[PDB]
């Protein structure tokens, strides 16, 4: 039985592991959707009612997401950091009024300052096009940045021709190895002496992947790639998803402790969702965003679910009910 760093208790329960050497969209989607829970490079059948830590899975859709103040704050932080640069070093630690006037004359003055003037906007001559308003716009325009009259910068999201013969993959192997071993050591010591050829191969290179055969006349790229970040002379690579043309599922990846205060890991999910929206808007039917795993006894799950509203489903149902109905019973 694995460790439960939580409420102290004697917990007995196992999600029996398994794995089949046959990759298909139906097989994997069923093995992740019907009822399942896994932690590792394996598919585990969960039989879990013995614990002190509730668990649940949540899936959302992109139809209801809009930016908030926190999203604006993180976006501004990232933009300003990337643009203006920063090299910090942290350390530990006269006329008078009348009573009747005050009320009535001032209220009427406000009313007759609002009313007597020509001030009105008039215009009457799928729909995510819009530019006519004195209103802030969405995040789509801000996904791509603008640079001043200088040449020192780099922003790009380049596709990966996935085939294990390249120099970049070899360097990325060592970079990810060092990053994740350091992260593991920092968060909680874990014996790193197991790092061998087979161990690292199964840790990073191995993954359930298959090719996509398009039955159309395509002018586009099919997304099974990696996402990179741009920094000083050492490039990062953090992104893992394989997309047959019905699938949206991304697996978590590790970060250096610096990312705790300089990165945008949470915003990475929003960026990838925006990329999927951009690649799907052209001609396709896709409303898929499935990533949920929570051990929730805290006020964090409300922030996590802020991505809601979204449709819910338990494994006895045939009607798509909005999360509002399920909000109280389980969430509260």
């Amino acid at each position: 039985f694995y460790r439960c760093g939580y409420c102290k208790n004697e917990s007995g329960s196992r999600s029996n592991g398994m794995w089949a050497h046959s990759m298909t969209v139906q097989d994997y989607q069923d093995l992740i959707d019907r009822g399942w829970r896994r932690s590792g490079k394996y598919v585990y059948k969960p039989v879990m009612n013995q614990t002190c830590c509730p668990q649940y899975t949540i899936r959302c859709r992109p139809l209801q997401f809009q930016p908030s103040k926190s999203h604006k704050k993180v976006l501004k932080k990232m933009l300003k950091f990337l643009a203006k640069g920063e090299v910090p070093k942290g350390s530990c630690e006269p006329p008078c009024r009348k009573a009747k006037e005050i009320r009535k004359e001032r209220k009427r003055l406000k009313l007759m300052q609002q009313n007597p003037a020509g001030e009105l906007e008039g215009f009457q001559a799928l729909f995510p096009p819009k530019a006519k308003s004195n209103q802030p716009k969405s995040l789509e325009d801000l996904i791509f940045e603008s640079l001043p009259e200088n040449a020192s910068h780099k922003l790009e999201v380049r596709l990966v021709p996935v085939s294990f013969e390249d120099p970049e993959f070899k360097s990325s192997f060592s970079q990810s190895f060092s990053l994740y071993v350091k992260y593991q050591v920092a968060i909680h010591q874990d014996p790193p002496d197991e790092c061998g050829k087979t161990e690292f191969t199964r840790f990073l290179c191995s993954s359930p992947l298959e090719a996509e055969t398009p039955p159309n006349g395509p002018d586009c790229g099919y997304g099974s790639f990696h996402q990179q970040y741009w920094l000083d002379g050492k490039i990062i690579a953090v992104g893992v998803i394989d997309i047959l043309p019905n699938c949206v599922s991304s697996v978590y990846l590790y970060y250096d402790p610096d990312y705790s205060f300089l990165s945008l890991g949470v915003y990475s999910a929003l960026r990838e969702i925006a990329f999927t929206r951009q690649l799907h808007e052209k001609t396709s039917q896709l409303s898929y965003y499935y990533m949920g795993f929570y051990i929730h006894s805290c006020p964090k799950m409300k922030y996590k679910g802020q991505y809601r509203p979204s449709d819910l489903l338990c494994p006895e149902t045939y009607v798509w009910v909005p999360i509002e109905q399920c909000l109280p019973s389980l969430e509260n």
Partner: peptide
């Protein structure tokens, strides 16, 4: 997410 099994585990 929050889980202690993921951080400490003899598997990959």
């Amino acid at each position: 997410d929050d889980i202690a099994a993921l951080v400490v585990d003899n598997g990959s």
